[PDB]
Write a protein that holds these residues in place. Structure first.
Motif, PDB file in Angstrom:
ATOM      1  N   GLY A 116      44.099  37.152  41.159  1.00  0.00           N
ATOM      2  CA  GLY A 116      42.960  38.013  41.428  1.00  0.00           C
ATOM      3  C   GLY A 116      41.671  37.468  40.831  1.00  0.00           C
ATOM      4  N   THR A 117      41.706  37.120  39.548  1.00  0.00           N
ATOM      5  CA  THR A 117      40.527  36.579  38.893  1.00  0.00           C
ATOM      6  C   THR A 117      40.224  35.203  39.460  1.00  0.00           C
ATOM      7  OG1 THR A 117      41.899  35.687  37.097  1.00  0.00           O
ATOM      8  CG2 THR A 117      40.872  37.843  36.752  1.00  0.00           C
ATOM      9  N   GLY A 118      41.264  34.508  39.922  1.00  0.00           N
ATOM     10  CA  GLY A 118      41.077  33.184  40.501  1.00  0.00           C
ATOM     11  C   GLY A 118      40.204  33.261  41.741  1.00  0.00           C
ATOM     12  N   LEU A 119      40.557  34.170  42.648  1.00  0.00           N
ATOM     13  CA  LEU A 119      39.799  34.355  43.882  1.00  0.00           C
ATOM     14  C   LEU A 119      38.383  34.850  43.570  1.00  0.00           C
ATOM     15  CD1 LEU A 119      39.815  34.314  46.965  1.00  0.00           C
ATOM     16  CD2 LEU A 119      40.675  36.631  46.913  1.00  0.00           C
ATOM     17  N   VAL A 120      38.275  35.859  42.709  1.00  0.00           N
ATOM     18  CA  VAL A 120      36.976  36.395  42.317  1.00  0.00           C
ATOM     19  C   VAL A 120      36.097  35.229  41.854  1.00  0.00           C
ATOM     20  CG1 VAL A 120      35.775  37.875  40.691  1.00  0.00           C
ATOM     21  CG2 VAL A 120      37.909  38.627  41.639  1.00  0.00           C
ATOM     22  N   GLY A 121      36.726  34.259  41.191  1.00  0.00           N
ATOM     23  CA  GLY A 121      36.005  33.093  40.707  1.00  0.00           C
ATOM     24  C   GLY A 121      35.624  32.146  41.837  1.00  0.00           C
ATOM     25  N   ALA A 122      36.541  31.927  42.775  1.00  0.00           N
ATOM     26  CA  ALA A 122      36.257  31.048  43.900  1.00  0.00           C
ATOM     27  C   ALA A 122      35.179  31.654  44.805  1.00  0.00           C
ATOM     28  CB  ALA A 122      37.542  30.793  44.690  1.00  0.00           C
ATOM     29  N   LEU A 123      34.956  32.964  44.665  1.00  0.00           N
ATOM     30  CA  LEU A 123      33.958  33.688  45.464  1.00  0.00           C
ATOM     31  C   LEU A 123      32.606  33.944  44.764  1.00  0.00           C
ATOM     32  CD1 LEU A 123      36.249  36.296  47.310  1.00  0.00           C
ATOM     33  CD2 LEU A 123      35.446  34.035  48.070  1.00  0.00           C
ATOM     34  N   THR A 124      32.603  33.915  43.433  1.00  0.00           N
ATOM     35  CA  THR A 124      31.401  34.121  42.620  1.00  0.00           C
ATOM     36  C   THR A 124      30.246  33.173  42.984  1.00  0.00           C
ATOM     37  OG1 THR A 124      32.799  34.820  40.776  1.00  0.00           O
ATOM     38  CG2 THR A 124      30.527  34.200  40.265  1.00  0.00           C
ATOM     39  N   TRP A 133      35.637  33.280  35.139  1.00  0.00           N
ATOM     40  CA  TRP A 133      36.796  33.840  35.835  1.00  0.00           C
ATOM     41  C   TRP A 133      37.962  32.858  35.828  1.00  0.00           C
ATOM     42  CZ3 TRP A 133      37.133  38.712  36.545  1.00  0.00           C
ATOM     43  CH2 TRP A 133      35.970  39.473  36.725  1.00  0.00           C
ATOM     44  N   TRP A 134      37.646  31.594  36.095  1.00  0.00           N
ATOM     45  CA  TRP A 134      38.630  30.519  36.085  1.00  0.00           C
ATOM     46  C   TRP A 134      39.343  30.550  34.734  1.00  0.00           C
ATOM     47  CZ3 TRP A 134      38.695  26.248  32.653  1.00  0.00           C
ATOM     48  CH2 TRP A 134      39.656  25.259  32.947  1.00  0.00           C
ATOM     49  N   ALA A 135      38.547  30.699  33.674  1.00  0.00           N
ATOM     50  CA  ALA A 135      39.023  30.745  32.294  1.00  0.00           C
ATOM     51  C   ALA A 135      40.057  31.843  32.040  1.00  0.00           C
ATOM     52  CB  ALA A 135      37.837  30.921  31.349  1.00  0.00           C
ATOM     53  N   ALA A 139      44.088  31.621  31.337  1.00  0.00           N
ATOM     54  CA  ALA A 139      44.633  32.272  30.158  1.00  0.00           C
ATOM     55  C   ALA A 139      45.824  33.144  30.539  1.00  0.00           C
ATOM     56  CB  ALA A 139      43.566  33.098  29.488  1.00  0.00           C
ATOM     57  N   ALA A 140      45.816  33.643  31.773  1.00  0.00           N
ATOM     58  CA  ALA A 140      46.892  34.487  32.281  1.00  0.00           C
ATOM     59  C   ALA A 140      48.092  33.628  32.609  1.00  0.00           C
ATOM     60  CB  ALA A 140      46.434  35.227  33.528  1.00  0.00           C
ATOM     61  N   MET A 141      47.816  32.433  33.132  1.00  0.00           N
ATOM     62  CA  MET A 141      48.852  31.462  33.501  1.00  0.00           C
ATOM     63  C   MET A 141      49.581  30.910  32.289  1.00  0.00           C
ATOM     64  SD  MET A 141      48.618  27.602  34.976  1.00  0.00           S
ATOM     65  CE  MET A 141      48.289  26.924  33.318  1.00  0.00           C
ATOM     66  N   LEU A 142      48.830  30.694  31.216  1.00  0.00           N
ATOM     67  CA  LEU A 142      49.402  30.173  29.987  1.00  0.00           C
ATOM     68  C   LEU A 142      50.321  31.229  29.385  1.00  0.00           C
ATOM     69  CD1 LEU A 142      46.243  28.354  28.653  1.00  0.00           C
ATOM     70  CD2 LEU A 142      48.277  27.403  29.761  1.00  0.00           C
ATOM     71  N   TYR A 143      50.035  32.501  29.675  1.00  0.00           N
ATOM     72  CA  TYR A 143      50.856  33.602  29.180  1.00  0.00           C
ATOM     73  C   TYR A 143      52.194  33.576  29.908  1.00  0.00           C
ATOM     74  CZ  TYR A 143      53.042  38.124  28.930  1.00  0.00           C
ATOM     75  OH  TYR A 143      54.034  39.070  28.811  1.00  0.00           O
ATOM     76  N   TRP A 185      41.559  22.813  40.797  1.00  0.00           N
ATOM     77  CA  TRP A 185      40.516  23.792  41.099  1.00  0.00           C
ATOM     78  C   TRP A 185      39.217  23.449  40.350  1.00  0.00           C
ATOM     79  CZ3 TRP A 185      36.964  27.155  39.316  1.00  0.00           C
ATOM     80  CH2 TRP A 185      36.674  28.334  40.027  1.00  0.00           C
ATOM     81  N   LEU A 186      39.363  22.997  39.112  1.00  0.00           N
ATOM     82  CA  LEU A 186      38.215  22.665  38.272  1.00  0.00           C
ATOM     83  C   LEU A 186      37.398  21.447  38.742  1.00  0.00           C
ATOM     84  CD1 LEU A 186      37.018  23.793  35.574  1.00  0.00           C
ATOM     85  CD2 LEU A 186      38.381  22.075  34.410  1.00  0.00           C
ATOM     86  N   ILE A 187      38.083  20.389  39.172  1.00  0.00           N
ATOM     87  CA  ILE A 187      37.415  19.166  39.621  1.00  0.00           C
ATOM     88  C   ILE A 187      37.253  19.094  41.139  1.00  0.00           C
ATOM     89  CG2 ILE A 187      38.466  17.990  37.644  1.00  0.00           C
ATOM     90  CD1 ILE A 187      40.309  16.566  39.546  1.00  0.00           C
ATOM     91  N   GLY A 188      37.753  20.117  41.837  1.00  0.00           N
ATOM     92  CA  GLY A 188      37.679  20.161  43.291  1.00  0.00           C
ATOM     93  C   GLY A 188      36.498  20.930  43.863  1.00  0.00           C
TER      94      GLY A 188
END
Ligand SMILES: *C/C=C(C)/C=C/C=C(C)/C=C/C1=C(C)CCCC1(C)C
Length: 227
Positions: A116-124, A133-135, A139-143, A185-188
């Motif tokens: 969810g935050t990923g998409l919100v970030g790709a759309l920001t 948002w990416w951050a 952080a959710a993925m590391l969890y 996602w970060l370098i793309g």
């Protein structure tokens, strides 16, 4: 349109489609209840991916988000795929080690935030906020990975070595592939815009295909799926 990444979209569609059918055919032959369970979850994963790769191949799931002074091409169909494929792969792993309902709920919820935050970030539209948002997504993925490495692996020890050893492989392939997504996602296109879309699409299909069909082959060919 004929965008440069379409050949990679056509290859992901093919691989996902073939992988779906092989799993389907293998799944409806098995009589074991538990095996059926795993087969139905693992066949649905590449089936959802196929429909989305096919839609993107056909021109859908693509939007132009403005930031950095450009009109950037963001493929949102990807999160429509991962929103249901990531929690399903987590369920496969959860059922394998006999995780608890609270664990599963927490892993699926975390996965929902991540996408969810990923998409919100790709759309920001504010460049720097895309990374805020990416951050949170990362952080959710590391969890999730922490739970899979510290939690699950621990409960897979109450299982038989065959089940514990199949989980270690699926757990390792997951830790390695999943960790790769946030970097791409970060370098793309969604981030720095260093790696072009066509190459970016190629990296994602190699990760998506490995994480689903690769994961499915390993899991469905094992005897650990039997009740
Ligand atoms: C079949 C698809 C799979 C197994 C997808 C896994 C996807 C991830 C682990 C995605 C992670 C992301 C982040 C950590 C942050 C930025 C955005 C995402 C959604 C690309």
């Amino acid at each position: 349109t004929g965008r440069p990444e379409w050949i990679w979209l056509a290859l992901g569609t093919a691989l996902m489609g073939l992988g779906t059918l092989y799993f389907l055919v293998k799944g409806m032959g098995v009589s074991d209840p538990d095996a059926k369970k795993f087969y139905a979850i693992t066949t649905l994963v590449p089936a959802i991916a196929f429909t989305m790769y096919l839609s993107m191949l056909l021109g859908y799931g693509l939007t132009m988000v403005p930031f950095g002074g450009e009109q950037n091409p963001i493929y949102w169909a990807r999160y429509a795929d991962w929103l249901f494929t990531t929690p399903l792969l987590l369920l496969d792993l959860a059922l394998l080690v006999d995780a608890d309902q609270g664990t599963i709920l927490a892993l699926v919820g975390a996965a929902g935030i991540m996408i969810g935050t990923g998409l919100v970030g790709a759309l920001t539209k504010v460049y720097s906020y895309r990374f805020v948002w990416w951050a949170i997504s990362t952080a959710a993925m590391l969890y999730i990975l922490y739970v899979l490495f510290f939690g699950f692996t621990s409960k897979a020890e109450s299982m038989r070595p065959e089940v514990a050893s199949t989980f270690k492989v699926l757990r390792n392939v997951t830790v390695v592939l999943w960790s790769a997504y946030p970097v791409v996602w970060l370098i793309g296109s969604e981030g720095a815009g260093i790696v072009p879309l066509n190459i970016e699409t190629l990296l994602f299909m190699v990760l998506d295909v490995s994480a689903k069909v690769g994961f499915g082959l390993i899991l469905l060919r094992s005897r650990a799926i039997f009740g």
